[PDB]
């Protein structure tokens, strides 16, 4: 069990050796924002149906990196995400932790891009969009298995067609997480497990001249 | 002023004719491109991933579809009596519609090779079995019990050790023509031993199905689907 | 109804899933009459049909050329000789709003002359986006290439019903970052909108799990 | 109206702003129309249009070729085999002055014989001025290329109306000594005056210098 | 007798078919150039030279267009205030429709780089003051007061003793499509000190605004104007 | 634009011409063959029996 120590934030975690990169690129170029963001939990219970968050949006209120992008114009950045969870030995379930570049749902400002608390999905089946889940596993993702892993990394490097962008319109991804395998417990347990999101920039350029 | 000749087969408009034409704009640069990450040069590449079998696809879960995708293990049930059964089908309707493969041979008339098929326990830590993976060659006949079963090849899965599993189906192949001729196996799988448990833990699991190709598939004949 | 014989044991190549011969095939993407205004405005639009909709939206990114063909005919089949104008019109420049208006002599759009007894003519279009491919799929707020515009040449009207039909090719395709395939029926052809009162499961159904 | 986003980084190549890409399109200079004389004179003009006037006179010499390209119909669309003549008088002979006189046959006048269900004829010219370039702009007291003219051949009147229309492209052309760009309504096609009476500024018009 | 073939595309005029065609005098001879001094061989050249901005583009001006040309400084205003704002679009109607950048950029559809403004004071010289040339970058707001404005990208311009000065916008950007895609910013006028002047010399004097290209702007898709 | 003529011959289909024509499958590849045994590569090896 190593611990990990990035800026004036450090988190301890396994050295898991089984991380993914999306698509074989590490983030590369073309003080305070290289650090471990954490955000909010959400609580896995018994009829819950899916997340999501979208980035950069989620990043936009939070810290040096939320004001750093709304007086900039331009942007670039890499990521790297960390997802777990924490459950004893007498539960059971399993999680689909997969990202998705240009994610474009379908049916206001509040639903397309909440923030930082992220959404909940009404339809997982067609992942609110019209295409279905059994095929999500194309894209880069990892299969977080209560019986035997409580950890999953994505590296995700920087993915568009112009080499810069805006940070207050555009969203590059969205991350998914569905409980396909639905948990379940005895009674006299912990009713809902906690689900903790860690996100750390990797390479971020601002040009934006303010 | 030099003897040119006419043949038959001028004039006419072949769909698929692959010539070069007279540019609308002559003097324009298109935009360079730049490097984007993720580039696909060749289909087989997206057909080489494991996706969801659709396994348990009854006819009451059309309502609540996200019940298909998992079909369970239960404690009650005897030892040595069949758990699920499905023929290995990525052309024809049925399990195989809901993957990746599946959609990917609607567009193509023949294909062959092999794929392979991987297993995934979602239980409880504390709880352990024993399952039996068998699978009948093509042109044979279903097992009636545990016993024939394990006379053909058969993986003796016991997941109080090993979560995954994976089993290699040899050789498929396909010539569409509404009728086709297709050489396929059956995959059964078996309760080896019951649904051992201690006190606290659920009693019902369930088991998640993927499924993906091999290094030597390979398909032809483009067509349109329906 | 499956049959058991007839089996293959010889590997094809793999030249048949390459992405180029993917989108080889040239097919039609419009159909345009003109009845006896007498101008017409087509803008090239890739997601005309459901077909080739579904094929492109496999990926993300896409960046290739295209090459069009104007077959020309009565209602039903006959030629006579008549004399046709298609005006191309680049994205940036205004549409022609009458049969006579000004942009039809505009000197920078660039026009085929064509008359019907002939064969059809044939146009390749290069890439025409400021990025550096196309996209299907937007999620910020805020693809097009262009406007086709045709008319018979002439001061007088003439008596003859005109229907054509355009045919593409896509030829120097490169794609990026695949996607699932959609299994839901459309409803418009700009936003990924579903029937909610209904989902349709991606497979048939059958009775029970032992029943093969 | 005015948007935000969409901005672009890369730079672009420099041959888009030759002078060879500024002149190289093909436009209609001229519509010849022939009602059921007999026949027409059309001098070689460039400025017969506002349009590629005031792109010419932006420099004050040029030197350059032309192609002419002649698109013949009747007043709607439809074609018959008709018989043509277009007779192209150099700087210094004689004009045609009836449909029968003695110029039509002189052996240092070229002509082409084309019907009317051919393709269009195309002709290049060179360049004709004693001088070594043109100038649009002469300061003192005393650029003639040509004259074209068009008949039905016969010696009989041909019962149909003839409509045709002249296109021009410009080949290998060099400028000299640039020139202020014209903000001005023309009045003739020889002198540059304008009207005295009225003066319209070049920009449009605000309200205060703070209010942006 | 060769074979040939007559694909689709025979036959037709393409108005932008850059071929060669038979010429009418074959056996003519041109009159051979001769050097001419100026010879304009791209039309970038002639975009990198500093034409009078038309900043004083009031209403009443309309009648006397000779005023345009030039915005007043005077004695009687305060310190601390707001002289003249214009915002730099090359392509769009105001102040640059009069210079020889926004008459060639009617003529194209996609242009980017960089542009310089030059001011030249045209005062008495026996008066002095100082002024400040704040720009604000694309996607900002306009500055409130002279605080703000300071603290952006700002130079110092003091007329007493340099009477000229330059400022160098870092880069634009447009695509047209009737609406465009322009990413722009804005450039104000501030007034750092009144007006000093001696006994005799004028009161009020007058700024001439100078505008032209970068090295690194570029074009592209010729286009017929309006 | 190279000057050509038309001989007379053109625009007829001789019904022994063999030539070549454009493949209705660009895109497509034959089955590559294999050894069977019994090749005849001329009428005159049945006609010595």
Same mark, same amino acid.
């Given at each position: ?12 975690? +396994? ?31 018994? $009829? ?37 969870? !924490? ?34 999905? #009404?339809? @997982? ?31 995700? @490097? ?6 810069? $962008? ?45 | ?55 348990? !696809? ?82 044979? !006949? ?15 899965? $016991? ?44 009693? #019902? ?22 | ?58 990926? #993300? ?20 000789? +008549? ?25 920078? !759009? ?79 052809? #700009? ?15 059958? $009775? ?5």
């Amino acid at each position: 069990v190593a611990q990990l120590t990035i800026g004036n934030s450090t988190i301890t975690t +396994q050295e898991a050796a089984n991380i993914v990169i999306a698509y074989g690129e590490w983030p590369e170029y073309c003080v305070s924002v290289n650090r471990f963001f954490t955000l909010d939990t959400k609580s896995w219970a018994k $009829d819950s149906k899916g997340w999501y968050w979208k980035f950069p949006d989620v990043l936009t209120e939070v810290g040096v990196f939320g004001q750093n992008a709304q007086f900039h114009y331009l942007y670039r950045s890499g990521f790297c995400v960390h997802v777990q969870c !924490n459950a004893s030995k007498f539960h059971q379930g399993a999680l689909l932790v997969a990202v998705l570049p240009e994610y474009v749902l379908g049916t206001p400002y509040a639903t397309t891009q909440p923030g930082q608390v992220g959404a909940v999905l #009404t339809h @997982p089946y067609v992942l609110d969009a019209g295409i279905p889940l059994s095929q999500l596993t194309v894209c880069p993702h990892q299969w977080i298995n209560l019986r035997t892993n409580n950890c999953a990394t994505i590296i995700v @490097p920087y993915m568009n067609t112009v080499p810069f $962008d805006s940070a207050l319109n555009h969203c590059n991804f969205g991350l998914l997480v569905i409980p396909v395998v639905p948990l379940d417990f005895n009674a006299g347990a912990t009713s809902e497990i906690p689900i903790t999101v860690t996100i750390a920039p990797m390479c971020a350029e601002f040009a934006g001249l303010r | 002023g030099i003897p040119t000749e006419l043949k038959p087969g001028t004039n006419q408009f072949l769909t698929t004719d692959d010539g070069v034409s007279a540019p609308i704009l002559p003097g324009f640069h298109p935009t360079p491109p730049i490097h984007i990450p993720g580039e696909v040069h060749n289909l087989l590449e997206i057909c080489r991933v494991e996706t969801i079998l659709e396994v348990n !696809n009854l006819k009451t879960n059309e309502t609540t579809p996200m019940q298909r995708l998992c079909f369970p293990v239960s404690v009650q049930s005897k030892t040595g009596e069949l758990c699920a059964a499905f023929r290995a089908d990525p052309g024809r309707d049925g399990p195989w519609q809901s993957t990746i493969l599946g959609q990917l041979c609607r567009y193509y008339t023949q294909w062959s090779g092999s794929l392979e098929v991987t297993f995934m326990f979602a239980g409880s830590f504390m709880a352990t079995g024993k399952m039996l993976i068998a699978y009948t060659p093509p042109g044979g !006949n279903v097992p009636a019990d545990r016993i024939t079963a394990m006379l053909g090849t058969h993986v003796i899965w $016991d997941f109080g050790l090993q979560s995954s599993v994976t089993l290699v189906v040899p050789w498929i192949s396909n010539t569409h023509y509404y009728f086709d001729y297709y050489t396929t196996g059956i995959i059964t799988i078996w309760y080896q031993t019951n649904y051992v448990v201690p006190i606290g833990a659920p009693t #019902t699991a369930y088991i998640v199905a993927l499924a993906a190709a091999q290094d030597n598939f390979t398909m032809k004949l483009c067509k349109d689907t329906e | 109804n499956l049959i058991e014989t007839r089996c293959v044991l010889n590997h094809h190549s793999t030249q048949e899933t390459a992405i180029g011969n993917f989108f080889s095939r040239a097919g039609l993407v419009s159909i345009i009459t003109m009845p006896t205004d007498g101008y017409v405005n087509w803008d090239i639009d890739l997601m005309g049909y459901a077909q080739l909709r579904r094929k492109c939206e496999l990926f #993300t990114y896409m960046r290739f050329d295209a090459e069009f063909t104007f077959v020309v005919a009565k209602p039903n089949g006959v030629l006579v000789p +008549q004399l046709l104008q298609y005006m191309y019109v680049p994205p940036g420049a205004p549409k022609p709003t009458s049969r006579d208006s000004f942009a039809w002599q505009t000197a920078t !759009n660039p026009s085929v002359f064509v008359k019907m007894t002939d064969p059809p003519a044939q146009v390749s279009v290069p890439f025409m986006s400021p990025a550096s491919a196309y996209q299907w799929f937007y999620d910020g707020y805020p693809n097009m290439m262009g406007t086709f515009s045709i008319r018979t040449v002439g001061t007088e009207k003439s008596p003859h019903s005109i229907t054509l039909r355009v045919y593409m090719r896509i030829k120097h395709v490169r794609a990026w970052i695949p996607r699932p395939l959609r299994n839901q029926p459309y409803l418009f052809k #700009t936003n990924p909108n579903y029937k909610g009162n209904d989902i349709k499961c991606t497979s048939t159904s059958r $009775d029970k799990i032992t029943t093969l």
